[PDB]
Amino acid sequence: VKIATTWLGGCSGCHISLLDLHEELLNLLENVELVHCPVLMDVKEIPDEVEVALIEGGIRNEENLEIAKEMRERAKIVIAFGTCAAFGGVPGLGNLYSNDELLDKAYKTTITTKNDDGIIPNEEVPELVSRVKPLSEVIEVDYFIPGCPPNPEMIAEVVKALLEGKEPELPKKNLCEECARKKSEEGVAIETIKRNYEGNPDPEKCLLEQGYICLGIATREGCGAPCPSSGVPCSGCSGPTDAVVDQGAKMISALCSDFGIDNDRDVDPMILPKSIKDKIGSFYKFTLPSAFVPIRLK
Amino acid sequence: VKLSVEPVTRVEGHGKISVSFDDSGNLDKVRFHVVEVRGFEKFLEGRYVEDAPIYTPRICGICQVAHHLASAKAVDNVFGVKIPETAELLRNLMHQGATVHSHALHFYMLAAPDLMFPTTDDVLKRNLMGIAKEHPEIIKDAIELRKAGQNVVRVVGGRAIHPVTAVVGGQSKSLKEEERDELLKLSERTIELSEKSIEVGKKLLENIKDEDLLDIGYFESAHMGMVNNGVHDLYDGKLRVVNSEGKVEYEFDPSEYMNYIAEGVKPYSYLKFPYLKDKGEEDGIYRVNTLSRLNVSDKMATPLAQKYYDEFVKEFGKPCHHPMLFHYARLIELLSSAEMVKELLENDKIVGEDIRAEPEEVVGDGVGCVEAPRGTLIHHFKTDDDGIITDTNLVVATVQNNPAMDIGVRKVAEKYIKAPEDATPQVLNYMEMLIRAYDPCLSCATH
Amino acid sequence: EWEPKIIGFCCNWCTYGGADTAGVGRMQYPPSIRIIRVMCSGRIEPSLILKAFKEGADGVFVGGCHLGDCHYDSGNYKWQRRVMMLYELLEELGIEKERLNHEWISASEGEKFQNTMKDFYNKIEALGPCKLKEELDK
């Protein structure tokens, strides 16, 4: 099967996760024909008759937009490869600023920058798109592999399903099932909200119950929940489930509902908003571009 | 006639080389352009400073550990906390494991295709798969090296890609004695494969010398790297700068980097052009990573790497300015990192339970610095009293080799091109081979 | 020329009834709002409010039972915690806090509903249109 890969406004992490198949990558390449992959081979142009296309990264500039459309016309099946392609990713946080503000910082006001002329690179470089957009906003996407980056095994299962003429199936639950942390039978009740550095977390008890903002509740399973298992809350990098459009909104809903639930009628509703100094960064680290309100109005 | 090599392949990120000729057919302009930028420095404003080690790894998928640790370090300085010795060891263990994965990835997956096949016209042969068909043991060993590196990162960092254990004050988890013992058993093999890789590199660079490709993109410059009491160190130390003749010009703590480094801007690229602030853009050009680090170091901290380094210095001298020798210095560092993994695992403090310190009052500024596989990495954050970022500056490794790449690609074309007919697939690939010698990570470089 | 676009979410047991009472009493108010019925204000959550802004809402109104009077005992206590976070989330997104309005209005409080609609209309009308949808269409 002829497959091709490319990268847009991402970090290369999804391609690195594909390489993290290790010995299995060679076995995968035996049953597949890699016709385009900038990081691995020197085929400069996307060829015609591509069967499966793995597109990493979201839309950040006019060149990405061009390549997405180019790959869409040459590929039969297009896959939004990873959280950046599927939801926008961390680069999506740039949507909280105007493109002029992003560029002025990087090319003028950064402390080590010496640019008295105040020039913004504009020759032989693509202009940025008004805002970061998920791949599906600009082209028709057939499938998506969520994760920042998706685990190697999940990438193989998806590609192997397409090789066998089968429909890929993503896991459907939120992360708490996979998570090894202990959850109360009585249900979740949050007394106070803590920043990740505040306090000393219990390694067995659920991090959300302990007062930490854990996105596991509003995030699709599949990663194996290595973050809570490694002592830190989930940041929601796999994105939401199939039944949730806006991950951050649903996380805020859940958090607000169980906050002070044991003192439901008497808990001060102003405590929670005052406690969270960075609301967008707390609930939309990986999915701001795919949210109902994906930008900060200027 | 306007030729363009786009995209530059077997490099991380988006880059291109433009080659132009005048109406008389003579070579006129040759430039290296980086066509991507995301704006991490600006969008980090308003974020919780403790979330920086979650965001910065997303600058790059290859060197996410370096970013995780550079941010974790800057964050520890923002909260005025000195982390326990066990945390420093665990952080360095993760860092060395990442360096093994990155150096192995570049030399075998990205660079070797050209060193093995420098004169072929077949692009379907000039890649990982081409090497695997003829020499499967070369790639199987490369995969083993990477697997070993990523295993250390997964065990110490929680995740092989985008680790999460470097938190405020230290580490979120300890290395269990069982985990330490298994990594220690597996550690010997990594050193062994890294040592076997140096011979592969010697043999492959000999093939490059036989085709007069060892001097491609040659130019002299200053060199920057981190040194711990003059010794090679990728985790802790001071940043040392040597001139083209090898004499030390600067030695400074990373927190004072803004008084030594300056970054220029050109209209044809999203990648900035740094230089030694006081020397200027013309006389202040410097290079980072592998060869630059070996050039500033008095010696390697590991016994095996030191032998190959001493053998290398006696043959090519010091400082070595050859871009193609960066491949060889990379292999020396690959071995040195493999050796450091064993050394750190052999330290009994690595399994300690005092892994984190309580955060102190918020100090409004913090500079975190480590030597990423591709060069000096500096994460600088400024925050308010509540620890919310107000300003940031990221001097990311490959940006410092941007002038070298722009110069080197020009020097290659000057040596092989006189008219557009001379710009053949092999000659255009020689220009890409120069770019590849610096192991560029353009997503990293632009951020 | 321009007339604000306001969307309302009113609980069946109280605010929706309070809006009906204003109608029975012929208590006139501006025709910008279009009310959506739910069984409890506890049904309201950020996704619905944010969805309204994405579609083009200049203002969003949410009406529920007085605190302690919820037909389902405590649904409004959850909504109250959600709306407080939502006010600040909107400000971070550059959407004025004042474009969202929540009130507790009983089944017979027609006068209160009328005056609330008048006040909320004047507040949105004075703020002018929300430019979100225009910016997203660009």
Ligand code: NFU
């Ligand atoms: N190595 C490395 Fe990064 Ni992908 C680069 N260049 C960062 O500091």
Ligand code: SF4
């Ligand atoms: S998803 Fe995560 S890993 Fe894949 S590109 Fe975006 S950032 Fe890099």
Ligand code: SF4
């Ligand atoms: S820790 Fe995060 S993921 Fe694990 S259970 Fe509690 S909430 Fe779900």
Ligand code: SF4
């Ligand atoms: S735990 Fe949450 S954050 Fe960590 S990997 Fe799974 S999804 Fe991404």
Ligand code: FES
């Ligand atoms: S029914 Fe009116 S708020 Fe619950």
Ligand SMILES: [Ca+2]
């Ligand atoms: Ca920078």
Ligand SMILES: [Mg+2]
């Ligand atoms: Mg944040």
